[PDB]
Point group: C3
Chain length 110, copies 3
C-alpha cells in the first residue's frame, strides 16, 4: 500500500521517525507485510482543512486492497485517526483520510 | 472539495495566507460551504510545466461534485486561472488544473 | 503527461536541474513533445519504501496516453528506473512507479 501524509506541522514539530511508526502501524492495520508498505510525509506545507488553518493532516491510502464501500474501510480509518491524533496531537476534526483503489498493472517495479 | 497546489515559487515568494484566500475562493467558485473546503500548498518544489522551468503552478481539484465533462468544469477552471494568475503573478500558460471525481465511500472522517 | 517525483533525498543532494533532465527523458520515453511534459520534484520528504527509510523515490505518471495493461507500460517503467537509478544513485529496489490514466475533460488549460 501507498500512504501519503501532508501536514502544516513544521518538519521540526513532526515526531522523529513518524514515517517508520506509520509504516509499521499501516502494515498491522491493513494486514499487509511491512516490506509492501510505502509512506511519504510532506511537512511544513500551508494547509486549510474544513476551512481552517489550525494544525491538520491529510492522509491518502492507495492499494490493490481498497474495496469501494465505506464499511470495508471504516475499521482502517478508525485506526489511522487513532494513530495520527496521538502522534501529531491533532483533534479528530483536524484529519481527513482518502482511500484510492489501484490495480496491479498501474504499479511498476524492477 | 480537496485542492492541492504545487509551485516552484519559493515559500517566501508565495503570498502570506494564500491557502486561506484559495479556500474562500474555492467555496465561492465551487458553490460549497467553506467548512468542506480543503487546500494544500506545496511551495519551493522543482518544476517544469509545458517543458519549461519558469515560475508555474499545478492545481488538483478532487470532489464528489466533479462531473466528467469539460463544460461542467470550464467555468470553475476559468475562475481558478483568474485567482492564481493574480495571486502568483503567473501567466495563463504557467498554470494547469486537473479535476478528479471522488465518491463518498473514499472519504474517511471521525 | 504529468510526472510527480517524491524523494527523501535532501534538496541539496538532488542533482541540479533534475526536473529538466526528467522532462526531456519523459518526452523521449513516452514519445510526447516536451511542451506537453510536466514534472514536479518534491525532495527532503520523510519516506519509507518497501518498509525501509534508505534513500528512495516514488514516481507517479499521469497521462491520456496510459493503457491499462502491464505490458503497455513495462518499456516506459524500465526507462524511468534506468533514469532515476543513474540520477539519484538509487538501487532498482528503492524506486516505485505508479501509472494513472487521465481523460481530456479532467485537464483545465486557459
Ligand atoms: O502484488 C504484487 O506482486 C505487486 C507488484 C507490484 C507492486 C505491488 C504492490 C502493491 C501494493 C498495493 O497495491 O497495496 N503495495 C505494495 C506493492 C509492492 O510490492 O511494493 C505488488
Ligand atoms: O458528504 C458528506 O457528508 C461527507 C462525508 C465525508 C467527507 C465529505 C467531504 C466531501 C468533499 C468533496 O468530495 O468535495 N469535500 C469535503 C468533505 C468533508 O466533509 O470534509 C463529505
Ligand atoms: O490534448 C490536448 O489538446 C490537451 C488539452 C489539455 C491538456 C492536455 C495535456 C494532456 C497531457 C496528458 O494527458 O498526457 N499532457 C499534457 C497536456 C497539455 O497540453 O499540457 C492536452
Amino acid at each position: 500500500p501507498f500512504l501519503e501524509l501532508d501536514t502544516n506541522l513544521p518538519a521540526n514539530r513532526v515526531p522523529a521517525g513518524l514515517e517508520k511508526r506509520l509504516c509499521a502501524a499501516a502494515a498491522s492495520i491493513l494486514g499487509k507485510p511491512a516490506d509492501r508498505v510505502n509512506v511519504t510525509v510532506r511537512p511544513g506545507l500551508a494547509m486549510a482543512l474544513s476551512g481552517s488553518t489550525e494544525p491538520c493532516a491529510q492522509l491518502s491510502i492507495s492499494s490493490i486492497g481498497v474495496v469501494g464501500t465505506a464499511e470495508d474501510n471504516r475499521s482502517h480509518s478508525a485506526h489511522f485517526f487513532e494513530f495520527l491524533t496521538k502522534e501529531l496531537a491533532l483533534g479528530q476534526d483536524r484529519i481527513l483520510i482518502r482511500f484510492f483503489p489501484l490495480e496491479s498493472w498501474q504499479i511498476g517495479k524492477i
